[PDB]
Amino acid sequence: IHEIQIAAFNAAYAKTIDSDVMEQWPTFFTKDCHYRVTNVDNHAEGLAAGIVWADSQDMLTDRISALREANIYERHRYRHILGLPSIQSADATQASASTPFLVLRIMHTGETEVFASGEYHDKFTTIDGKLRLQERVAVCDSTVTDTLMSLPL
């Protein structure tokens, strides 16, 4: 597992969220994954809470369900701009990697702002063909989220 394979998976992950084909987003994770949105201060102090906290793929599907069916929020999109992954350790089938990210938010009425940046802390595994996330934790540089966070990072 090389950085450009992870880069390629990251392109599809990002493309998925950015194009609002949100139903596909859980498929990027194993059945029993961890996914968490957090910030450096929590990370630094070893605090476990997340803005999003999931320990199964089902919970990701349900989060998406709620986005579709229940939650009220104004329309907006993301634009993800990722950097090159760094691998901490890798096999032929598993990897620990971090990836730097920037996420713009563009309101439907036109305003664009830097909504989040940081790095994903990942554990990857290979099911069949391609890479799959067992863990993705989005450690955000800022402790501040503007208004609300409706789409996952």
Partner 1 sequence: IIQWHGATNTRVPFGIYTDTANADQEQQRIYRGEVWNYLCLESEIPEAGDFRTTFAGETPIVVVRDADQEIYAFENRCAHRGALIALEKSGRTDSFQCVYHAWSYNRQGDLTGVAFEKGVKGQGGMPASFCKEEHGPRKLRVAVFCGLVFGSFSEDVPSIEDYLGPEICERIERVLHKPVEVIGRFTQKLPNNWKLYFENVKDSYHASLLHMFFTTFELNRLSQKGGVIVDESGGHHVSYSMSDNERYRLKDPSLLEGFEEFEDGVTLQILSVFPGFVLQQIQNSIAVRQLLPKSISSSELNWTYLGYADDSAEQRKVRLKQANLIGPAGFISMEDGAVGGFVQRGIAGAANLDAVIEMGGDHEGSSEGRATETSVRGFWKAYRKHMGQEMQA
**Under the rule (CB under 8 A), what is the footprint of a copy of itself?**
3-4, 7-8, 10-12, 14-15, 18, 40, 77, 79-86, 98, 100, 102, 104, 106, 110-114, 117-119, 141-144
Name which of 89 and 109 has its Cβ closer to partner 1. 109
Report the C-alpha gap between 11 and 21 in whole angstroms.
14
Report the C-alpha gap between 40 and 7 in whole angstroms.
23
**DSSP code of residue 64:** H
- Shortest Å distance, C-beta 61 to partner 1: 5
- Please, which residues have CB within 8 angstroms of residue 129's CB and are 6 or more apart in sequence? none
Q: Which of 112, 109, 51, 46 is nearest to 78 (CA)?
A: 112
- List interacting residues with partner 1 (CB under 8 A): 37-39, 41-42, 47-56, 58-59, 61-63, 65-66, 69-75, 108-110, 143-150, 152
- Shortest Å distance, C-beta 98 to partner 1: 21
Which of a copy of itself, partner 1, none has residue 114 at its interface (CB below 5 to 8 Å by kind)? a copy of itself
- Shortest Å distance, C-beta 144 to a copy of itself: 3
- CA diameter of the chain: 46
Which of a copy of itself, partner 1, none has residue 128 at its interface (CB below 5 to 8 Å by kind)? none
